[PDB]
């Protein structure tokens, strides 16, 4: 295994180093506004060395943006595909590339058989070529790598099954900035090439000057280069026709033949295209070839890529004709005039890359190596696209909930083969497809119109219901005596109980377990642990009595704590935000211990008085002018006091101190250690009163944030043996700090209400001597070093925080893990900040045509880990990566993949069993079974199960922590007959494994294996 910590890779271009050296000046470069006047030597190409030009027709089809997926499909995409089929069928030399499989599958299944056969023929002959082949073209900033892989697999599995092709070239022309997680996943999925477009205009200029727009993109920790994927970065401001033929859009726009008038389009530069004729073809070719030769100067080979397309293009038959006939006249002239020394033709993306690599092998070019990312993108001036790291945060959080539910449903149901009548495959396909659709670069990014966001939310809600159905049928089958099991595949044997989604104060969706002497004495509950190691975690349920005790199925008592059910209310009469307690529902909390990828059953039983093994939390309300807070049968009366500082400690864990406003002020790790200043603060950013305004994409603050005026907020302190907390009702946020013995959990119920033109930020202030350095993650996969640059505006220093961020000095580190992707930064030494929500009345002029005014309450969740790191073996100062400690990685897993909780629905569960998975191996902590998916239906004689195994890399800090079992996923199911290593999409077998044993992977690697069973 390669060492991912101690060896700094030697690359030609390292993006953090490039950023440190670049000046980012925005000067007027002439017709190429953000470049320079390109010059070329006319003698460079001659009869023995011609410029080969591939014009690649395309149509960018968003699966939701200004219209819903179905609306665009009916109004636009179905016509584009039907006419592409007809025009390619009838014109053998015409070509077209297609990226979004969600639309293609929707179209293909509606075609008659004669047309399905015509479509398969134009794909098999190479006229229509799929690029990437994912369900969507995903966002690369907020997406979790597990969902990027999920959507890639959904689209490619469909293509292999119906079109018999697997793309090896990727096309990503619209995500707003680009992540190295893409080449990481693509290279492990059989790809050989990829293309990107939205990178900072200063980066395009810098790389163009050095002819470094094509590069071998490797991961930041990869010393050897085996993760490298050839990447082509487009050079210009857009992928539309005016910015793809060459540097001068006023000239290129004249070669978009849809802009002469009858289609309702025109050229902003005021010179229209003209139909090509024998009288103008020489002057028109002179102009076009000059643009091509200028573009070719920015690259190293004699093969030039010329995309020809725009959003929802190629819809009308007349549009196909006008583009094709005019380009054919140009090619016939250009290719016959030896003096141009050009051979131009329609082509596909793969044809371009194959020709580039033929040139490379002929020794005509060598390509530079590059590591790093391409965030934060700016398309012009100071317009940095960091707003969408936070826009529509409710749905960003929903993405992570559904991510976990899909994994848990696929894993729980993979253990058995299911009859078709159980509809398991049907429900899982629906859930995977709705989550995959939301990875679109207008889905999770929060950049779609309001009604489109509602469509994505409804789709995801249906997907969550599908996952619940599959999970609960699976639990019932895994935990019921086989000869007793009698399933009704439409019945709900269990209901899921989720304490954090939609969350307290967001939706009263949780069921109360109703017990009573005259109705039901007890209830079975079951916990599932999708992680491959034994895990303990506190779990809570709502119950109708405070006198409840817990037992495991061997009837051993389990220690429990009962606390009240507190809800917060914005009291419009008293104008205060304060909590109300229930007098008939209570929370019971206990530690569940669950096997690796397993299930554990417990029983909750009511008694007439306080149970021996259940304790009760105390509650203290701090506010002036208190009023009584009765709690029914709860045995401890609520206490009251004036606001004051307070301190809490659960177990042997840290001691936390809070201000009189209920906000953390310090953390003391152990009895003797110092009280380290760690202060939470809420602030607000506004919008500019002149110039460009913030919107769904752009963050254009009117200066540094201002503290939110807090008044004298109401603070609620609950102190328990198993769990304590401090909650405060601030304007726009009920902020909670929860302690269970280790790093605290933070929950914010964020309701920005009607605060227009406001972005609310949560900041941590410490005295850690971080300087200008901080770390943020990329797609939940890796942590990358960031350097704050005062030569760039505030919004340029914001980066995606898809799952965590940290600051550190020689001795101390503070890591904030998230349960949802949000934007954040470290704007001063010792600080971390993360945006909670943003409400914007203005549009940011990118085409969305609305502000962001559809905010709704969202429960954001986090873990806050303060640690001593002086003994940790960390990368050197020049390494571009950072790594989590064991505690921080486990805290991230507690947010993203918590235990699942099931409540038995009926009164009695006959044949109930106490555990599943007790014999499953408990794998080393850095290893995860990211995906477990049965790949065959029940009619297959040979069953196949696919696993994606990911190993992260955790810092060595002196903890022996060992004794674990080797995990061989190929032997998790019985009767294994074969084990194969495959691409991550499971679509190609790469190695037949000896002994049917799937080896574990190296740190930072991901592998896939498929086991076959007789
Ligand atoms: C506003 S940017 C982007 C949206 O968020 C959608 O994804 C849409 O495809 C659009 N493309 C880029 C584009 C815009 C205008 C003209 C040509 C291309
Ligand atoms: C699928 O493509 C392969 C490669 O061209 C070809 O050999 C095969 O016949 C095609 N159809 C089948 C058999 O799946
Ligand atoms: Zn788009």
Where in the chain is CATH 3.20.110.10?
Answer: 1-381
Atom of ligand 1 nearest to the CA of 848: 1
Asked if 913 and 601 touch (Cβ cutoff 8 Å), the reply is: yes
| Nearest ligand atom owner, CA of 239 | 1
CB 636 within 8 A of CB 615: no
What is the spatial distance between Cα 499 and Cα 476, in angstroms, rounded to a whole number? 22
DSSP 243: G
| Residue ranges matching CATH 2.60.40.1180 in the chain | 493-617+898-919
Spell out the long-range contacts of 34-40 with Cβ–Cβ below 8 A and sequence spacing 24 or more: 34/201, 34/202, 34/204, 34/205, 34/237, 34/380, 35/204, 35/205, 35/208, 35/235, 35/236, 35/247, 36/205, 36/209, 38/247, 38/294, 38/295, 38/297, 38/298, 39/297, 40/293, 40/294, 40/296, 40/297
Count CB-CB contacts under 10 A for residue 202: 18
What is the dotted CATH code of the domain comprising 618-897? 2.70.98.30
Q: Is 174 annotated in some ligand binding site?
A: yes
Q: How many CB atoms are closer than 10 A to CB 279? A: 8
Query: Mutation test of ligand 1: which of 72, 847, 850 has the most ligand atoms closer than 8 Å to its C-beta?
Result: 847
Give percent helix, percent strand, percent coil of the chain, each to the nearest 5: 25, 30, 45
Q: Evaluate whether 504 touches 564 at the Cβ level (below 8 Å).
A: no
Nearest to 413 by CA among 488, 363, 321, 478: 478
Q: Residues spanned by CATH 1.20.1270.50 within the chain?
A: 382-492
Cβ neighbours of residue 449 under 8 Å, at least 6 residues apart? 65, 66, 67, 848, 849, 850
Q: Tell whether the torsion through CA atoms of 197, 203, 208 and 213 is positive or negative.
A: negative
Q: In 487-575, which ranges are E strands?
A: 494-496, 512-513, 522-529, 535-543, 548-552, 557-558, 560-571
Place of tokens 């205009």: 201
Beta strand pairing call for 51-60 and 342-346? parallel
What is the rounded distance in angstroms from the CA atom of residue 561 to the CA atom of residue 539? 10
CA of 100 to the centre of ligand 2 (A): 23
CATH 2.70.98.30 domain span(s) along the chain: 618-897
Ligand 1 atom nearest the C-alpha of 62 is: 9
- Atom index in ligand 1 nearest the CA of residue 445 equals 5
The CATH code of domain 1-381 reads: 3.20.110.10
Which listed ligand is nearest to 120 at the C-alpha?
A: 2
CATH architecture, domain defined by 920-1014 = Sandwich (2.60)
Domain 493-617+898-919 has what CATH class? Answer: mainly beta
Range 382-492 has CATH code 2.40.50.100? no
Q: Which atom of ligand 1 is nearest to the CA of 847?
A: 1
Calculate how far, in angstroms, residue 238's C-alpha sits from the geometric centre of ligand 3.
12
* Ligand 1, CB within 6 Å, residue ranges: 60, 62, 65, 174, 238, 240, 310-311, 441-442, 447, 846-847
Q: How far apart are CA 717 and CA 620, in angstroms?
A: 5
DSSP-derived secondary structure for 161-220: HHH-----EEEE-SSSSB-THHHHHHHTTT--EEEE----HHHHHHHHHTT-SEEEE--T
62 labelled ligand-binding:
yes
Closest CA to 1014 of 986, 981, 976, 965: 976
Alpha-helical (H) ranges within 418-539 are: 424-438, 450-478
Spacing, Cα 65 to ligand 1 middle (Å): 9
User: What angle is formed at CA 422 by the lines to CA 418 and CA 426, rounded to 5 degrees?
Assistant: 95
Give residue 312 CA to ligand 3 midpoint distance, Å.
10
Q: Which of 311, 312, 695 to mutate to test the pocket of ligand 1 (most atoms within 8 A of CB)?
A: 311
Q: Token pair for residue 852?
A: 């962001």
Q: Would you say how long the chain is, in residues?
A: 1014
**Mutational pocket test of ligand 1: of 174, 244, 310, the residue with most ligand atoms within 8 Å of the beta carbon:** 174
CA 97–ligand 2 middle distance (angstroms): 20
Q: How many helices (H) and strands (E) does the chain have?
A: 16, 51
Residue 628: partners with Cβ closer than 8 Å, 6 or more residues away = 638
Please give the number of the atom of ligand 1 that sits closest to the Cα of 66.
6
Measured CA to CA in angstroms, residue 454 lies from 394, 434, 460 at distances of 11, 13, 10
| Burial environment of residue 993 by CB neighbours within 10 A (0 to 12, 13 to 18, 19 or more) | middle
For this PDB entry, the determination method is X-ray
- CA–CA distance from 498 to each of 402, 856, 901, 902 (Å)? 12, 19, 7, 9
Burial of 438 (0-12, 13-18, 19+ CB in 10 A): buried
Closest CA to 475 of 497, 507, 506: 497
CATH 2.60.40.1360-classified regions of the chain: 920-1014
Residue of the CA atom closest to atom 5 of ligand 1: 442
Cα 282 to averaged position of ligand 2 atoms, centre (Å): 44
Is-cis flag, bond preceding 376, omega within 30?
yes
Ligand in closest contact with the CA of 161: 2
- Across 481-519, b (16+ Cβ under 10 Å) vs e yields eeeeeeeeeeeebbebbbbbbbbbbbeeebebbebeeee
Catalytic residues: 174
- Pairwise CA distance, residues 100 & 95, whole Å: 17
Ligand nearest to the CA of 164: 2
Q: Is 60 annotated as a binding residue?
A: yes
| Residue among 976, 983, 966, 961 nearest 927 (CA) | 966
Task: Please tell me whether residue 750 adopts helix, strand or coil conformation.
Answer: strand
């Amino acid at each position: 295994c390669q060492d991912v910590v101690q060896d700094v890779p030697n690359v030609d271009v390292q993006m953090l180093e490039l950023y440190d050296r670049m000046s980012f000046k925005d000067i007027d470069g002439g017709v190429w506004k953000q470049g320079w006047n390109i010059k070329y030597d006319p003698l460079k190409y001659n009869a023995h060395h011609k410029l080969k030009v591939f014009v690649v027709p395309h149509s960018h089809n968003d699966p939701g943006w200004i219209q819903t997926f179905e609306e665009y499909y009916q109004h636009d995409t179905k016509h584009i595909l039907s006419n592409a089929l007809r025009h390619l069928h009838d014109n053998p030399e015409m070509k077209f590339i297609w990226a979004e499989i969600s639309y293609f599958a929707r179209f293909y299944h509606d075609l008659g058989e004669n047309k399905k056969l015509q479509m398969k023929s134009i794909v098999k002959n190479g006229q229509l070529e799929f690029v990437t082949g994912g369900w969507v073209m995903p966002d690369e900033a907020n997406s979790h790598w597990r969902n990027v892989l999920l959507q890639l697999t959904e689209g490619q599995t469909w293509l292999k099954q119906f079109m018999n092709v697997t793309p090896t070239a990727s096309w990503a022309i619209d995500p707003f900035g680009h992540s190295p997680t893409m080449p990481y996943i693509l290279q492990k999925s059989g790809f050989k090439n990829m293309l990107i477009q939205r990178t900072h205009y200063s980066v395009k200029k810098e790389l163009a000057q050095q002819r470094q727009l094509e590069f071998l993109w490797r991961q930041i920790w990869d010393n050897k280069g085996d993760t490298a994927l050839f990447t082509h970065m487009m050079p210009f401001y857009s992928y539309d026709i005016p910015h793809t033929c060459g540097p001068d859009p006023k000239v290129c726009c004249q070669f978009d033949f849809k802009r002469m008038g009858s289609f309702g389009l025109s050229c902003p530069w005021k010179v229209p295209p003209r139909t090509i004729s024998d009288q103008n073809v020489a002057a028109r070719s002179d102009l076009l070839v000059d643009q091509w030769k200028k573009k070719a100067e920015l690259y190293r080979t004699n093969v030039l890529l010329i995309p020809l397309g725009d959003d929802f293009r190629f819809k009308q038959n007349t549009e196909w004709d006008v583009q094709r006939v005019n380009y054919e006249r140009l090619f016939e002239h250009i290719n016959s005039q030896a003096h141009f020394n050009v051979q131009a033709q329609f082509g596909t993306l793969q044809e371009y890359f194959d020709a580039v690599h033929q040139a490379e092998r002929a020794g005509q070019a060598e390509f530079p190596t590059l590591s790093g990312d391409f965030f934060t993108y700016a398309d012009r001036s100071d317009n940095y696209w960091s707003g969408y790291y936070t826009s529509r945060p409710y749905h960003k959080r929903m993405d992570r909930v559904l991510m976990h539910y899909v994994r848990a449903a696929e894993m729980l149901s993979a253990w058995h083969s299911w009859d078709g009548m159980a509809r398991i495959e049907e429900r899982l396909e629906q859930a995977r497809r709705e989550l995959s659709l939301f990875q679109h670069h207008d889905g999770i990014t929060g950049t779609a119109k309001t009604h489109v966001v509602v469509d994505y939310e409804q789709r995801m809600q249906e997907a969550l219901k599908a996952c619940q159905m599959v999970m609960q049928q699976s639990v019932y089958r895994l935990l019921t005596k086989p000869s007793i099991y009698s399933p009704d595949f439409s019945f709900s044997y269990f209901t899921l109980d989720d304490s954090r989604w939609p969350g307290s104060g967001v939706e009263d969706s949780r069921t109360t377990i109703i017990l009573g002497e005259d109705i039901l004495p007890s209830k079975h509950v079951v916990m599932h642990n999708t992680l491959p190691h034994w895990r303990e975690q506190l779990v809570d349920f709502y119950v109708s009595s405070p006198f409840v005790s817990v037992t495991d199925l061997a009837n051993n008592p389990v220690e429990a704590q009962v606390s009240p059910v507190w809800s917060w209310h914005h009291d419009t009469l008293t104008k205060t935000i304060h909590p109300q307690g229930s007098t008939t529902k209570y929370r019971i909390i206990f530690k569940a211990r669950v096997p690796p990828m397993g299930l554990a059953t417990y029983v909750l039983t009511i008694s007439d008085s306080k149970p021996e093994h259940t304790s009760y939390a105390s509650n203290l309300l701090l506010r002036k002018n208190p009023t009584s807070l009765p709690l029914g049968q709860y045995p401890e009366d609520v206490k009251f006091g004036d606001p004051r500082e307070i301190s809490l400690r659960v177990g042997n864990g840290p001691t936390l101190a809070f201000s009189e406003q209920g906000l953390l002020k310090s953390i003391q790790l152990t009895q003797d250690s110092p009280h380290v200043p760690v202060h939470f603060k809420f602030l607000k950013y506004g919008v500019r009163s002149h110039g460009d305004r913030s919107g769904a994409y752009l963050f254009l603050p009117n200066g540094p944030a201002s503290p939110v005026e807090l008044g004298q907020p109401v603070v609620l302190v609950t102190k328990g043996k198993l769990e304590s907390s401090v909650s405060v009702g601030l304007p726009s946020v009920v902020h909670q700090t929860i302690m269970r013995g280790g790093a605290p959990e933070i929950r914010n119920l964020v309701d920005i209400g009607s605060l227009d033109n406001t972005e609310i930020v949560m900041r941590l202030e410490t005295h850690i001597d971080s300087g200008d350095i901080f770390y943020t993650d990329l797609n939940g996969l890796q942590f990358i070093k960031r350097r704050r640059l005062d030569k760039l505006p505030l919004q340029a220093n914001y980066y995606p925080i898809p799952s965590g961020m940290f600051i550190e000095d020689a001795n101390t580190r503070l890591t904030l893990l998230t349960g949802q992707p949000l934007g954040g930064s470290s704007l001063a030494s010792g600080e971390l900040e993360i945006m909670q929500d943003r409400r914007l009345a203005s549009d940011d002029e990118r085409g969305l045509g609305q502000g962001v005014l559809d905010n709704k309450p969202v429960l954001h969740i986090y873990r806050l880990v303060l640690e001593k790191v002086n003994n940790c073996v960390r990368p050197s100062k020049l390494h571009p990566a950072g790594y989590l400690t064991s505690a921080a990685h486990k805290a991230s897993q507690s947010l993203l993949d918590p235990l699942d909780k099931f409540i038995f629905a009926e009164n009695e569960w006959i044949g109930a069993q106490g555990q599943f998975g007790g014999d499953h191996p408990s794998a080393r902590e850095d290893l995860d079974v990211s995906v477990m998916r049965r790949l065959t239906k029940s009619s297959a004689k040979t069953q196949r199960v696919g696993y994606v195994l990911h190993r992260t890399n955790l810092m060595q800090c002196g903890t022996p922590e060992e004794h674990t079992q080797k995990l061989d996923v190929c032997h998790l199911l019985p009767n294994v007959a074969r084990c194969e290593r495959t691409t991550l999409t499971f679509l190609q077998n790469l190695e037949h494994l000896d002994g049917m044993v799937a080896p574990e992977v190296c740190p930072m690697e991901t592998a896939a294996y498929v086991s076959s069973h007789s």
